[PDB]
């Protein structure tokens, strides 16, 4: 709401972080970690 791009800030590294996802009833999704950069969509638009 305030216009900040970063969703979170001032995060202690601690023991590390891992990718995680959660799905509810009757839901489907595709988790692309990016083993092949060619299949990774919108990476060149932002992040590359």
């Amino acid at each position: 709401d305030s216009g900040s791009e970063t969703a979170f800030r001032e995060i202690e590294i601690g023991d590390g972080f891992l990718p995680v996802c959660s799905l509810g009833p009757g839901q489907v999704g595709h988790l692309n970690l990016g083993q092949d950069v060619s299949s990774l969509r919108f990476f060149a638009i932002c992040g590359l």
């Binding site: 216009g3 060149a44 638009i45």
Partner: protein, 814 residues
């Protein structure tokens, strides 16, 4: 407990009942219940699991004289009845007539409970009787407590104020007596408020509605005395002070912090939960209309309250669910709102004729309020039903009258044009029908002609010809043609102020909203889109509009006292979207190139002036300070359009390499370079932002994509990837080398020479696997080739990127 005693340390007054004679016609009930209380106490004793005993003892922790009726002495029976006598005397004393509907009649076989429900009317009487018990207890306790004069019993509190946990004893006693009555059938008699009126909002709102007319009474008295017999003393001065001091801040704050709940609808809840009832949404509109008619005249009166009045009017304009108000609302409220709209329209007609008092009511109060209302309805898409029929004619006449002001060219119209233009843009946004292209208005259902029969139009005064209703504003064709012709000729703000101030908001607020209903935009409903669209605007005409606006801006970029440019940019902010890509090469590049040329020229003048220490050098520095200030104004006026354009086209520019984008990146990089080298630019921007209050507009643009917002993040930070994609990852080495080679205070050509000297310092795809996939992505780019592998192009891109990164990181880190 929606009831109060409405009475008045704390002295609980008991009820006087010994003086009045107690009726004894129901003694068969009085004595029966008096003994039944003790019988129920015996039942409670047997529930306690310890049986009754005859002999005295404190070891039984129960009633020690409790004996069966065969051997029960009547001495206790003729003394335990007194509380029941007093209870019935008090119950019958409060004008509560009791009638015996029925006519009939050691273990209490019939069980008296209190866990069953009861009617609200009789439960209120039971609660009052429990309150009577509590106040009698408080009186008898405070009689002994008052002998000291210090301290008080913690339970010496009003019955309504105390909590239920301590209320439980009196509540249970009253409920048990009432259950005895109910299962025996005694009808006692001495409201019906629904939960909607039970709400705090309903009561507060009805209180304000009363205070409206109460206040109108003394404002009428003030008008009478000021017209004749001016006396300082006022009969209702206390009421005037009460209205002026607290009630206006109260209503303002309450409807500021509760806008979301009132504006909520059952179809889709806007807030956390809940919504005002339909009657609530009609009393709020009634209050708004009554307040609008309150300030219709006598605006000079209560002048100290005038800012409060206009702020309350602005707040009441917001959080207005006029969609359901117009939907089968009260006749009085709808009539008042329509009368307010017609009064506003005829008022506007009055000063458009006067320009060829009203101004204090209109300019100061009426005009901003209608502007806010127009913004609200346009934002919430309420124009489908709120504005139609008489309201449609009202706003149509208002539009004709305000557009008729173009002929006027006196002093006051020049200063009044901003507010009129803003109100006109808001009304154009809020207009459901299409006043331009009237030839196609027949298909649209918003036109008054299509909603009324021709006989109805004739009897209502409508000429049954939309072209005749709007002869002041022709169809969009020649206004667009004239704006294009003025842009080509090079008209200034002084030359034709009305077009820029007034007729440009016309198109800027007409094209985008009506584009969605246009043929180009997809139809949400096929049957709805089957009739020919009443509006034929598409992306082409709004693109031409944006081009003409850009041409006008570039024609008047150097004109002094060009105050409204930024406002035009704001008015061009919604229309800058849906822009053709070729515009980047057509308008943005030449304009920003001219801006860069001017910036470089004034920077050269500043460098010439600053190389010498002299009073004349200080005067020249002041002159270039003024030039830098006007350049800041031109920048902040032109930049947001490019901001939104790059936000729209960044994905396309990154996916396919575009030469025009890279050229624009280089030129804006040079502009940023010039601002980095000159601190005068920084301080002039600092002064201009605070002076012209552009910070609010910059923040609004930022949140709808610090103080130096429009320069560092607006451009060369969003556009940084565009220039960072052309330079190769294998060139990355040279980058920080050049960066270090720029860190040594070296000039451009000198770092170019050492860049030529260190061509072989670049990396290779074999050097590290980290950049191998980067190289693969680079060669996977569709439009990329090997033409950039020439050393000249490499040194170009590396030098430019290194300088940009160096100065950007210096901007971030002091």
């Amino acid at each position: 407990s929606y009831s109060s005693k409405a009475e008045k340390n704390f002295d609980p007054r008991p009820v006087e009942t010994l003086n009045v004679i107690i009726p004894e016609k129901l003694d068969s009930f009085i004595n029966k219940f008096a003994e039944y209380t003790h019988e129920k106490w015996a039942f409670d004793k047997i529930q306690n699991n310890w049986s009754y005993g005859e002999n005295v003892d404190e070891e039984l922790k129960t009633h020690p004289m409790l004996r069966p009726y065969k051997t029960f002495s009547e001495k206790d029976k003729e003394i335990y009845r007194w509380p029941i006598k007093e209870s019935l005397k008090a119950m019958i004393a409060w004008e509560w007539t009791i009638e015996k509907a029925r006519e009939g009649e050691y273990n209490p076989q019939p069980p008296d409970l209190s866990g069953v429900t009861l009617s609200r009317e009789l439960q209120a009487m039971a609660e009052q009787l429990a309150e009577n018990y509590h106040n009698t207890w408080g009186r008898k306790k405070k009689q002994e407590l008052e002998a000291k004069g210090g301290g008080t019993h913690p339970l010496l509190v009003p019955y309504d104020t105390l909590t239920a946990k301590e209320k439980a004893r009196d509540r249970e006693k009253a409920q048990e007596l009432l259950k005895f009555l109910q299962m025996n059938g005694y009808a006692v008699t001495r409201l019906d408020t629904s939960s909607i009126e039970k709400r705090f909002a309903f009561g507060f709102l009805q209180q304000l509605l009363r205070w409206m007319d109460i206040s109108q009474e003394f404002i009428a008295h003030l008008e009478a005395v000021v017209s004749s017999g001016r006396v300082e003393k006022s009969p209702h001065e206390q009421e005037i002070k009460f209205f002026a001091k607290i009630l206006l801040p109260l209503i303002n704050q309450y409807f500021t912090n509760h806008c979301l709940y009132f504006l909520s609808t059952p179809a889709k809840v806007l807030g956390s939960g809940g919504h005002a009832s339909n009657k609530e949404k009609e009393m709020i509109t009634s209050l708004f209309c009554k307040l609008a008619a309150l300030v219709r005249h006598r605006v000079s009166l209560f002048g100290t309250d005038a800012p409060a009045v206009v702020n309350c009017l602005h707040i009441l304009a917001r959080s207005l669910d006029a969609r359901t108000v117009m939907k089968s609302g009260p006749e009085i409220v709808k009539a008042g709102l329509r009368s307010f709209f017609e009064s506003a329209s005829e008022d506007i007609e009055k000063m458009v004729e006067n320009l060829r008092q009203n101004l204090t009511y209109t300019t100061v109060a009426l005009l901003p309020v209608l502007t806010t209302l127009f913004q609200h309805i346009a934002q919430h898409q309420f124009g489908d039903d709120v504005i139609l029929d008489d309201v449609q004619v009202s706003c149509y006449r208002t539009l004709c009258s305000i557009y008729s002001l173009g002929t006027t060219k006196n002093t006051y119209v020049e200063k009044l044009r901003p507010a009129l233009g803003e109100c006109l843009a808001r009304l154009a946004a809020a207009m459901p029908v299409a006043f331009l292209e009237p030839q196609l208005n027949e298909y649209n259902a918003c036109s008054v002609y299509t909603t009324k029969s021709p006989r109805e139009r004739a009897i209502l005064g409508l000429p049954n010809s939309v072209e005749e209703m709007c002869p002041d504003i022709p169809v969009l064709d020649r206004l667009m043609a004239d704006i294009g012709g003025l842009a080509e000729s090079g008209a200034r703000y002084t030359e034709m102020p009305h077009v820029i101030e007034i007729t440009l908001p016309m198109l800027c607020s007409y094209l985008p909203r009506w584009w969605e209903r246009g043929p180009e935009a997809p139809p949400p409903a096929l049957p709805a889109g089957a009739p020919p669209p009443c509006t034929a605007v598409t992306s082409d005409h709004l693109n031409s509009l944006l081009g003409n606006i850009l041409r006008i801006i570039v024609n008047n970029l150097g004109i002094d006292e060009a105050t409204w440019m930024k406002r035009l940019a704001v008015f061009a902010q919604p229309i800058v979207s849906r822009a053709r890509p070729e515009l980047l090469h057509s308008h943005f590049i030449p304009t920003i190139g001219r801006l860069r040329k001017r910036a470089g020229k004034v920077v050269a003048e500043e460098e010439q002036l600053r190389l010498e220490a002299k009073a004349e050098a200080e005067e020249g520095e002041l002159l270039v300070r003024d030039e830098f200030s006007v350049l800041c104004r031109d920048l902040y006026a032109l930049y947001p359009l490019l901001i939104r354009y790059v936000d729209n086209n960044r994905a396309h520019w990154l996916t396919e390499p575009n030469a025009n984008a890279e050229e624009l990146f280089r030129m804006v990089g040079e502009i940023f370079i010039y601002w980095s080298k000159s601190h005068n630019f920084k301080r002039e921007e600092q002064n201009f932002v605070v002076q012209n209050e552009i910070n609010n507009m910059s923040f609004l643009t930022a949140d709808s994509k610090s103080v130096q917002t429009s320069l560092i993040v607006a451009t060369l930070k969003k556009m940084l990837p565009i220039g960072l994609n052309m330079c190769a990852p294998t060139d990355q080495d040279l980058i920080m080398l050049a960066k270090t080679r720029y860190a040594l205070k070296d000039t451009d050509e000198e770092v170019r020479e050492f860049l030529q000297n260190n061509l072989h310092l670049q990396g290779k795809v074999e050097g590290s696997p980290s950049l191998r996939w980067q190289m693969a992505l680079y060669r996977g780019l569709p439009g990329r080739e090997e033409d950039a592998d020439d050393p000249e192009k490499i040194v170009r891109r590396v030098q430019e990127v290194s300088a940009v990164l160096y100065h950007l990181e210096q901007t971030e880190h002091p």
